[PDB]
Symmetry: C3
Subunit: 175 residues, 3 copies
């Protein structure tokens, strides 16, 4: 099966979405779903000694301007394993470009973790913890000669707007 | 595929059973299987700083009184990855109720680790180990307001009977 | 089943798929349950050794010892089981296991610039080739088995056996 194709975007879109984690926090290896089989594939080894500061994944049955599934970042105190589904609550969206491609990424918190019960919008996140995620994606492909532009952070109301548009975009392409 | 439905209960029931692990030892994220897809899911982060004292999973093609597959606990020296199949030897069963539901759990050891070759019945497990587990499940939902009762441990003869009953509960429901 | 349906590689024999079954640093020995494709615990290595490499199989291959072709990938950070790697062969290990031709490819990840200049067996520090062979020489000693390390062949010979392993499979199943 291809969990990107088979799974639904979420049980209560857009307040709660399904996050399919490809990369646990602390990983220097970059993974992604093999578009053919849906198995975990090593994309590359980060050219620098950086690690994903967040549990990285995608929202199933979503498509975005950058020709990929919609990227999502989930804050987990304990990193999960690849190909795990999390019920998460979007709280914001990171606005960045990559080689002219709009590579925006939803930021989200888990619903079933009471530690984040009061995290509902971007302002609830420590400012330092936003700067760190921005600096990761600003620099994690420098030694690959790639230039990245961090444009800003949107609030929870915009993050949900983009998912509804990524959900449609998928229906348009594969529907 | 949903592994819970496609795998036989074991190669030699009830002496040896398959343990499909969902939660490695040392984990605090509580995982389960998605009935629709068979993928690993995040059930909940344990509200307390406790970690599963054992490799925790289910026995495929089983059904129990509490409306769920039969839980099995396997004592691994090194944790396995989720969704890994273990050929284990049952040695006992923990009799606990959870919110009024009969939620007994088989305790087992791996066949393929000679460390546990001499482990065969519940008496063979250090008392201090049987206490830590019973305390884990007694309390790992306390902050959630849920009440769990630890009745005690049954021996290997008992745990093996329950397996056969849980098997007969699966063929009956599906 | 990933072994049966994945291709052998995006550019064989120069770039092959490595389907990892055992991440580096693991004392457990995991193999693919060939009937479902799920990970399965073969056996806990009787001795305190850990796999020195990311160990797996090449899909749609079949070798003289009656199993998918073994391949070893030198990863700095070990991956998770069932992870695909596009690797480059730089050598091969020649060893007899119980009288069966049990050769294993040695390769590096294509997308790790650290190993950019690793193109043949000779670019590997000798002491590393000495640690792998010793692992396999003794990792089944307490089990009563006998493994015989013959030597190391170069890349030209590993790519051949890869092609000769892609055919046997077509002959065995195609």
């Amino acid at each position: 099966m291809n969990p990107f194709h088979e799974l639904e975007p979420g049980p209560e879109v857009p307040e709660v979405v399904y996050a399919l984690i490809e990369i646990p926090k602390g990983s220097r290896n970059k993974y992604e779903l093999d578009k053919k089989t849906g198995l975990l594939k090593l994309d590359r080894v980060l050219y620098s000694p950086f690690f994903y500061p967040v549990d990285y994944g995608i929202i199933p049955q979503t498509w975005y301007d950058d020709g990929d599934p919609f990227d999502i970042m989930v804050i987990m105190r304990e990193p999960v394993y690849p190909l795990t589904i999390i019920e998460a609550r979007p709280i914001g969206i990171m606005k960045m470009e990559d080689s002219g491609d709009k590579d925006w990424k939803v930021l989200a918190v888990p619903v079933e973790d009471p530690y984040f019960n009061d995290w509902k919008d971007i302002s609830d996140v420590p400012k330092a913890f936003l700067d760190e995620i921005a600096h990761f994606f600003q620099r994690y492909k420098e030694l690959q000669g790639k230039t990245t532009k961090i444009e800003g952070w949107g609030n929870a109301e915009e993050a949900k707007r983009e998912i509804l548009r990524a959900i449609e975009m998928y229906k348009e392409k594969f529907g």
